[PDB]
Paper text:
Yellow fever virus (YFV) is a re-emerging flavivirus that causes severe hepatic disease and mortality in humans. Crystallographic studies have resolved the structure of the YFV E protein and shown that its domain architecture is similar to related flaviviruses, with three N-terminal ectodomains, known as domains I (DI), II (DII) and III (DIII) and a stem anchor region known as the transmembrane domain (TM). Here we use a chimeric virus platform to resolve the first high resolution cryo-EM structures of YFV. Stark differences in particle morphology and homogeneity are observed between vaccine and virulent strains of YFV, and these are found to have significant implications on antibody recognition and neutralisation.
Numbering used by the authors:
A (entry chain B), B (entry chain C), C (entry chain A): 1 to 391
The structure:
């Protein structure tokens, strides 16, 4: 029961006549649903993932400049020009300067000057356009059949949800089945966002914010960088030669600005899905079709032993592993009570009807004790297993 | 001489100690200088000019759009681009079209679309640098030697000026010489300006106005038209479809906007030279080296004949033309008075000492009469020419 | 002289005789000094510099982590040491982690984790301490030498001006001599402050702000980096694992903080020199040992010609250039007046007594006309090279 493994867990109880019970699932949390005569069920959101985005824009975050060129003319010998102004891959600026005879000039006054440089991206952030139909929600489920730890990763059923897969049927061998309906149409707001990627790291960000970055960018299809001056400073002109400098690598500033956004991992092993951190989804469980497998079986009227002692969990419930011997397929009785007279059970089980199907079975049990001192009890007759507990 | 012809005229009268006399010459006007025992001098500003100024800019005012191309992308497939977008002689615009199944995209929404057009200029205005140092100007001058209107064009003295040689000298044959110190063409409007040329006409305009024209322009050295979006227009998008047009030829709007400027002319017959209008020049004339040619000669004594009657100039002088046919080179006496009987002269002889230069000769004479009724007289004796006149 | 060739200039007036004159030399400006008989004087800084200062620190701005490993212990079993945790070359963090049967561990609770990584600096600032004792200065001086601007580069008085070397004398010919005392040990405010170097660019800033940089740093050449956790992120532990990453290149963020600092240039050739910007000096200058030259040579009357007509410096004063062809040694006169009568000079002749030496060259002349209407006048015969001026 993998919710036992999860640090943050919520129990949910169905009304005796209810049919659907609903819960919110979010990645680091887990939920256990319980109903009065049916095996309890763990549910959790494993990942929200998205397949095959397409690039909208590349944004350059460190420019490098080459082949600087300059031209200048004297204060009344007409406007300066440079052939580089014609070329889209040249960043460029025009301005006046003071000029005087010592420059190789002919007059005193406001000369006219141009400089350009070949602009090239070294590294760039990629903004991906987000496919609002290819989102997938991945839910894990399992029943409290009471299987030992090492079996859990094989006994979970993995349900993948999307707008087509609007309801899913979870089948549990010999325990019947559950049906599950999660609200994918309204779980998240991706339509206003991009997946922003930097090398081996990524975020999901608002389209408006990204388009308002003060930073030079290019179409995903390729083209020409088209706000180049945002990364070039022209040092105001010394009258013989202006000079131009790259504004330096922005990486750390940029990813400082992203700190508010939700983290995303590109999974290089799982095809090329982008996996969101910290998404959530709302969902209904339908419980009618589950049944308590072993209800038929006789009580286990014979010796037992703990494979692991009853042990605390942060959830405020004890967990134990019990094994039988000389036993048929049979029902393990369990109670929690004030003293070994055991007149009134006060504990409420999570593993609703503990069973062994074969004498070599190794059975996990989880139970919520009342507050205060109490004795946990397993089995019946003078062979009772018993264990003291406090709160 | 030609101050007779020029409609707007000033008289300058030198006090005896004024070896120099100041004058202001204004481009349409004429000045007559008079001094007590010295021949009077007409003087006149003929031209103000710039030789071969440099082109600052060309401004396009009629554009046409040879090629057009469009690229478009569906609402979740990223930004469009074009190869032309990289190439400097293409105007371009970025927008989103609406898109949907009716136009081949898989999703309803707004799709990126970009269009570009190859721009070219049909006609452009040229702007030129006004070097305040290079302003040439030309002065006309004549003594009142009293020659026929037919002879002024031969007898005219022309004085050229530059920022160099502000002193200039006019000799007059048998009359001596005078010298002009001309201060610069005072040019009070011509700083911070361009000469604007547009086909067969031109204007001088301030730099700020010109640079603030909402029109595409390039350097005089040639290059790339820097603000093409003033003259291309893009219709709002339709699916996968932009219509682009030039704005109409702007010539008329530009001519009308320029109407307040001082107009400029090109001396197209002679030179690559631009001739201004509305100049002012201040000069001073040294008079002392002028002399009167015939003061030694005998008084002309035989009968004379009017080639032209006395007539009003409209300047309030009267002008006359007189023929002699007897007697060697001699002084022709002229006076104007009230009495027909022997009378003291009242008027000022603008032509101060009229003379015959040959036995059969024709002479022009100009006089400022007194106010009121009078008789004007030429010749000494019995057969005086005499003429009725008033104010 | 060359203080003409600079946008900002100032004019200081001394007094007759022995007096020292106060001056200032902020590194961009060039300043003019004059006195009622001594010629005018032009001075500027070349540079303020340090040679081979001492490293205070290196500060890393881009770390990379090359080995990572981890140790983890079940909750009751007590804290994890890890062998490299004492190795100064490794960054480390120690934190508890949640553990339980989903993690191969005996009891549910807070396990312990330690994780460490081998830190390496990839790129870093170098910081150099400076002491006023090591400040070099270099200064330019000129008066009215009459050298070609083509040769100022070799005429120019090149005062190397290290505070641990003797005061220096203006070694001019024919103008007497001058000397300078210039607060050389004490003009600056660079205390408690030091040079920061990036790749091929550099800045000067206070040691306090540098100490307050939240970045890992190293004192000596080699030795342990002091605060590596400022560039290592440890993602919160999960199960038996932690993931650690470099915080990414800070270069751009760091440079963004430096924009208000005064700039520095490490030299291109004497590669251990650092040339400071924004320095300044204040001086007193010994004018009284200077002389005019040719003070009683004849007032010239030769026929005389401009080579450059009166040009506004922008300093509120005029420059011009004049040539002559026979008065080769003679005193070229100039004055300024209300009228060409020139009864009195009314302006300040910033070259007070110009010196001719060749027929080949133009002489280089400056003048300051009074506010309002006036005539500038070169020569004083009828060879009046005269020009109207205004405020």
């Amino acid at each position: 029961a993998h919710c036992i493994g999860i640090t943050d867990r919520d129990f949910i109880e169905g009304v005796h006549g209810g049919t659907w019970v609903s819960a919110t699932l979010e990645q680091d949390k887990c939920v256990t649903v319980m109903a009065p005569d049916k095996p309890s069920l763990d549910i959790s959101l494993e990942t929200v993932a998205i397949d095959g985005p397409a690039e909208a824009r590349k944004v350059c975050y460190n420019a490098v400049l080459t082949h600087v060129k300059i031209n200048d003319k004297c204060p009344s010998t007409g406007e300066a020009h440079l052939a580089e102004e014609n070329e889209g891959d040249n960043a460029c600026k025009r301005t006046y300067s003071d000029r005087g005879w010592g420059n190789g000039c002919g007059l005193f006054g406001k000369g006219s000057i141009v400089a350009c440089a070949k602009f090239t991206c070294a590294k760039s952030m990629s903004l991906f356009e987000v496919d609002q139909t290819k989102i997938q929600y991945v839910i894990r489920a399992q029943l409290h059949v009471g299987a030992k730890q090492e079996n859990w990763n094989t006994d979970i059923k993995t349900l993948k949800f999307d707008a087509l897969s609007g309801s899913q049927e979870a089948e549990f061998t010999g325990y019947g089945k559950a049906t599950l309906e999660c609200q994918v149409q309204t779980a998240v707001d991706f339509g206003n966002s991009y997946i922003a990627e930097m090398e081996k790291e990524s975020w999901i960000v608002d389209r408006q914010w990204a388009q308002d970055l003060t930073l030079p960018w290019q179409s995903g299809s390729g083209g020409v960088w088209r706000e180049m001056h945002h990364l070039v400073e022209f040092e105001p002109p010394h009258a013989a030669t202006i000079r131009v400098l790259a504004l330096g690598n922005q990486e750390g500033s940029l990813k400082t600005a992203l700190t508010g956004a939700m983290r995303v991992t590109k999974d290089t092993n799982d095809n090329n899905l982008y996996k969101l951190h910290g998404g959530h989804v709302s969902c209904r469980v339908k419980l009618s079709a589950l049944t308590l497998k072993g209800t038929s079986y006789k009580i286990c009227t014979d010796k037992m032993f703990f494979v692991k002692n009853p042990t605390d969990t942060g959830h405020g419930t004890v967990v134990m592993q019990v094994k039988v011997s000389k036993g048929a397929p049979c029902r393990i009785p369990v109670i929690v009570a004030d003293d070994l007279t055991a007149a009134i059970n006060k504990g409420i089980l999570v593993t609703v009807n503990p069973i062994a199907s074969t004498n070599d079975d190794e059975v996990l049990i989880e139970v919520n004790p009342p507050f205060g001192d109490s004795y946990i009890i397993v089995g019946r007759g003078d062979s009772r297993l018993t264990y003291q507990w406090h709160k």
